[model samples]
Target chain A: PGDRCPRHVARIIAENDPPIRCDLTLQELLSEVQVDFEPSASEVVAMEGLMDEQHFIPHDPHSKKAAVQSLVIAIKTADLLLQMIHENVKRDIRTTCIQMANESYARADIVRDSLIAASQGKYTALGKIVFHSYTNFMPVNANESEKRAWMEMLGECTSHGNKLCEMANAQVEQETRDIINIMFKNIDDVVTQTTRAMRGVFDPPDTVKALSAAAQLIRVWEHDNVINDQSVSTSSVVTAALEANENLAKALRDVSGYAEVQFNRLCLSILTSAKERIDIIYHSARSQHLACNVRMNVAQQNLATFILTNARERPNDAVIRTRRAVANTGILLFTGQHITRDALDKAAESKSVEEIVGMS
Target chain B: PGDRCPRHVARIIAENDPPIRCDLTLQELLSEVQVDFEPSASEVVAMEGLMDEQHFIPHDPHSKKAAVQSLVIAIKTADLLLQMIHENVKRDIRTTCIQMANESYARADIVRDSLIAASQGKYTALGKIVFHSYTNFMPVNANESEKRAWMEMLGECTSHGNKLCEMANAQVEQETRDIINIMFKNIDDVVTQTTRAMRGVFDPPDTVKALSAAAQLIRVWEHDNVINDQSVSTSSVVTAALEANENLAKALRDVSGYAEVQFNRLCLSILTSAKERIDIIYHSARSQHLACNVRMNVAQQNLATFILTNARERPNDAVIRTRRAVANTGILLFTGQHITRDALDKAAESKSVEEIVGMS
Candidate 1:
């Protein structure tokens, strides 16, 4: 009976002043056993260091069993953190696209309105010239020569108005359509890339080699240099939209008249406001992208540290060792960790008990 | 020849020191004729007042012909200005929708990540309990009673873990899906309404009665009171998404464990950030909407003034009278002018030359 007693049960027996018989059922004996379940100081320190200030680890710190249990929690936490960062990046991109779309729509409206205004101005001028010709030369007793001269002036005014209308129509068809199409394409691309990134996170590549290759590609893309390059490319579309507006203004000016100059000035004012709006959209997107990248990268680095720490701390536990291997594999796949293919492959391989125990 | 001489040609003949022969072609005679085409003081003041400081009128203000010429220009400018305002309002709404979509996506991510973390923490705690039971009672020589006691503890841990997993899965499916669907619908509605508004501007109603009715409806919609109502409806969708997140947190807390409390705290932190973002999106949209309304209303009022001034200044001219009739009709149709139906009908009727000359 003494030999069969567990250490906890033995302790309960020793505490009694009179020795009790060890004939109690295991259920009754187990109930009598008491263990210090509170976390020890060293365990609390280790947990604090491992989880950082943001997370509260809710397990017995003194138990190696608790440490082993924390492996799944840590891994899951790291996974969720990575997922949160990815979603945030995607949201930032979509927000930028939406802002650009709004601005683009506004620019299109301004361009259309200016074109219509210019055409109307020319038509009004023509109407006045025609009315003046009729009043000045259409009297019953007027000279035929004066009538012919006024007719010529009327023809010139009508011709100019017709030309202005044609120009306005051409600009409305071409520039506005181009801006709308460009915006649509930009939005579509963002949606597609966002879907792809989400798939990459949720549906990882099957092979380690394939995943490593994808990680390498994603690492380059996730870098500040690459993100900045992308921003420049995106901003070029806005520049193109502005250039289209400028080109329309120049075309109107080429019509060469006092009215066209006045119309051009109106267009310029619209363009100035448009440029300000476009700048706000562009700069804000760039700033948000940079900020998002910083946050995501920090989370990625922390996740890598979390995996490495777990692997180092529990070198002898099979479950932890296996989890670390899988976690390191995921880190390389999702977080764009700066690890070599060979190193990651080795990290993913399951070590024998002898090897784990042999390691310091 | 003297009888056939136009007023401008007769002026040229009177100005010459030695009278030239009236045998010149009408073109030459007309070319030689010089008239005071510069604007009169009254004309300049009227134009300055009518156009406001924003526009420079580029026509001979002294001539009735010039005033008639300015009509088409004024009408077209008014039309384009209205279109600009309408487009601006649409853009503001679309921007708000985009911002809401982004915030919703972010909130969904936070909820999902928190749910995942909570489940992982509970699983970790269960693992600790199971491991403790196994080590304390799983020796080969252990009595059946001791083994049975430990097994009961393991079963309890397993049951709790399974329950936590089910809760997490349910939340991940329900809340995330609900948020995404709501955002998509909101964005789609904005896009549809934008298209409808654009069509209303470009394709006006054919009849005066129909147009007036349309204008009345638009007027009410464009008012500040109506705009504020729209913002409230839009904001409610955001609030619903937030409530879904809160409900999930509460449900997770109901699982009755230490781990859930830690997870709930993390979720609350995320919710706080989400609330800040949502408030920014909501307030910015409301402010922009109000500003857009003020600008549009001012432009509409100025447009009415422009038409009224032209009609009053050239009351005797048949063409100006005809244009005024048409212009007033358009004013009622587009600007939501506060004129009675009888007044508008009378304004649209063309007056004879006798009536125009008889009027003040």
Candidate 2:
């Protein structure tokens, strides 16, 4: 019976001062028995209140055998339920991170496309004019000097706009990578903790502590606000560029006296509109990123507390202690039934007699 | 006698002027019978030669019944083999395309990182100087005019560099998306062809034709040379920038008389080195992209030819014709055997006699 009985049952019996004996083997009594227990809504509320109050009451068993049986089932259920929750948490984190990263890339692309549309034609024209000037070839003769001054002003405006867009794209790519990396690291830590717990090497208290630490890591990342700050800085830069361009336009109108004034005004208006649109884009992206971060933080904290509550309750041992009392009263537990020795003998005799009658 | 027998067998018998009959049911004959056929190395070579020659010799059957049995097995084997090949081709294409897209992204990142490092410091400094000049708050006083000229030269160089990197990144992303889209489209076509063929709606020639058309689509994309041409153009632009910077450095040396010539020369040299490295990056990316395209093209062509060869051979129909001749000779096809009517009757009688003896 050394290996035939479950390890927990064998250990309990062996630890007794005087060796415990029963008419029925523990293996026969526990074989084919299954517990399919899920707490009802009221039961869940009761359990939560019990945890909050920090009160423990020992379960009084009808017999020692009943205590052992309850303990085995409780231990199995705890292990199974915990494993299920851990797997689910890992899966949810992975899926959510991927979705968030994809959304970030999509939003970043919208910004990139808007910038490209706004700057490409202006930038290309400026580049061509600048290249011709360097080659000592003038595209216009009558207003060469005026055009040169206009080109320089337009060049500065477009260059600044292009640089802003490029920086935005680079920052988004880097930040997205960082967020995804931290999320995967958190999931890996969860896996490591669960693996140790399954092997019985991690104590319940240690598991609770490890999960809390992992949650803290996510909290720090969520609160950093790097992307939000960058967006605000971008908005100010765009505003400054708009003001500078308007001043330049005014200077040109004063000097040239309405020569190319209408075109210059149109260009300035387009820049103003682009600035507004870009500000909106950045703000939207920041909001979306922050929302994802909040969701991720909440998920991590939920996992931490779920494990902490389970570790504190110690329900499995309570059932074991209650059932052990009945067994200690000299009753035999067999397949969820408690019977006296005389009753067991009478049942066996009746079964033997029936078999003989059937044979005849 | 209807669907209990395989459709092919039932059809063959019904088409006879006076319907043929067999002692054993076709279903009973085929029950528990399996054929596991894979051609040997020599057999495969022979098949290839047979396909190359465009000569098909009809198989001679031992009897009409033997021909029908051979035909049934050949039809099943052909269906199974073709389905397996189609699945393999589809899987290979999907896997290769994903791997290629990932590699493209990774290579693009390397180029992006290089560009960022080269431009960030220089660009930021130039922006600060330009912004100060605009605010009428000069950073330097001794040689304000000279500093302005130098700043303009540096500003243009850094601006062009940043623009080049941003455009390159945008183009790579677009092209990668296009490539993946087309690859998936080709796979979808393969799936469509296979589905039609499985349902017996698609003729052999149509399948071969559809595959060839799919291969041609891939061929067009593979030979486009878009990425290669862009890389060459990028290389020339960098070369031109290097020459322009060298001229500017010489002009500064002549005017300032070595006042800041050493620093300008150092900056020019760094730009020159950066140009060389950027050229190499573009070329490497082009080569890798081309290699992936070549592999993808080869895979598409292989699938086309595999389907073509199977269509041309027509082995399944040939077996059916030979076996139909044997069945016309008044012999019964039972699983893998051609049995005479008298022998089938004898087998049925012996089976019944054995059953009676067992009961006794």
- Taking every candidate in turn, the Cα RMSD to the unseen true structure, in Å, is 46.9, 49.7
Model 2, A153-219: lDDT tens per residue?
4344334323323333343344444544443343333232222212111111112111222222222
Task: Give each prediction's DockQ, rounded to 2 decimals.
Answer: 0.01, 0.01
Q: Supply candidate 1's per-residue lDDT for B116.
A: 39
User: A16 in model 1: Cα distance from truth in Å?
Assistant: 62
Candidate 2 ranges beyond 4 A from true positions: A1-30, A36-61, A122-360, B1-360
True lDDT of residue A65, candidate 1: 30
Worst 10 residues of 2 chain B by lDDT: B16-25
Task: State the C-alpha lDDT per candidate.
Answer: 0.33, 0.30
Model 2: lDDT equals: 0.30
